[PDB]
Design a protein around this ligand. Structure first.
Ligand SMILES: N#CCCN(CCc1ccccc1)CC(=O)N(CCc1ccccc1)CCc1ccc(S(N)(=O)=O)cc1
Ligand SMILES: [Zn+2]
Length: 257
């Protein structure tokens, strides 16, 4: 099955998922000099005060912090979006070294990791229906660079020992995702896709310009996770990122001058 290795990685995905070579694939390189300021874009509205986290899961490709999305509790609105998008989960992509790990790049620069806060358009009723729609999802992407620790990330870091291997989950209630945001909500936006199989072209990408800083020790703990299940040979969960895909007939818009 698909993964991030030599024999099942991104260059192989198109055989099972031909949309891998489609017209609106993600991630992409964000060329900052070519992105155009769009004064029509509204400020983002991130309303996470009532978020209800439930569980953290190692799914064999990353780890997901899952939320209760059966009501409008933590929602994303505004910016390029029409309607209300409910937070369902967040996860990260990261590298084996501090100079790689992000999926999006900025003027070809790779960050150490990238956080994805995944939201779905409530007009489609459930997440499975939303992924079948060109405007079904909104993913808020946030770059991580290595420097000072992010205090709001530590509760995630400290539970990773309990979900080392594929298929392990742990209770993860009362986690506040507002502690993972940078100061500025300035962003770039473009129409794209899920960055893993099934690579569905259902995502409005909103990528924040300002990275958050995490410590070397925090990212080192991400790198102790495993792709494998328990009782299988250890394969470290590192370099779980897809590289930049062709922009094709798309324009990246900036919320800021
Ligand atoms: N069992 C099992 C796992 C099944 N998942 C969903 C469970 C679900 C939840 C609500 C309603 C229906 C189904 C599957 C699941 O999540 N994805 C697969 C596509 C999908 C979505 C919904 C239904 C079928 C397939 C999305 C995974 C995904 C990939 C990449 C990014 S990224 N890097 O672009 O942000 C974000 C999220
Ligand atoms: Zn992702």
């Amino acid at each position: 099955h698909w993964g991030y290795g030599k024999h099942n990685g991104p260059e192989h995905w198109h055989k099972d998922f031909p949309i891998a070579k489609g017209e609106r694939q993600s991630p992409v390189d964000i060329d900052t000099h070519t992105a155009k300021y769009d004064p029509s874009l509204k400020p983002l509205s991130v309303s996470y005060d009532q978020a209800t986290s439930l569980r953290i899961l190692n799914n064999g490709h990353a780890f997901n912090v899952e939320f209760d999305d059966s009501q409008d509790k933590a929602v994303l609105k505004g910016g390029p979006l029409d309607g209300t998008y409910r937070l369902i989960q967040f996860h990260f992509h990261w590298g084996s070294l501090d100079g790689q790990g992000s999926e999006h790049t900025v003027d070809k620069k790779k960050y150490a990791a990238e956080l994805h806060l995944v939201h779905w358009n409530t007009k489609y009723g459930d997440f499975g229906k939303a992924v079948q729609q060109p405007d079904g999802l909104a993913v808020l992407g946030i770059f991580l660079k290595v420097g000072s620790a992010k205090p709001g990330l530590q509760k995630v870091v400290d539970v990773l020992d309990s979900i080392k291997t594929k298929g392990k989950s742990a209770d993860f209630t009362n986690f506040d995702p507002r502690g993972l945001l940078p100061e500025s909500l300035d962003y770039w936006t473009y129409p794209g896709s899920l960055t893993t199989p099934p690579l569905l072209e259902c995502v409005t990408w909103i990528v924040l310009k300002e990275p958050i800083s995490v410590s070397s020790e925090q990212v080192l703990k991400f790198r102790k996770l495993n792709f494998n299940g328990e009782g299988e040979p250890e394969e470290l969960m590192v370099d779980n990122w897809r590289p930049a895909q062709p922009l094709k007939n798309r324009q990246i818009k900036a919320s800021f001058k």
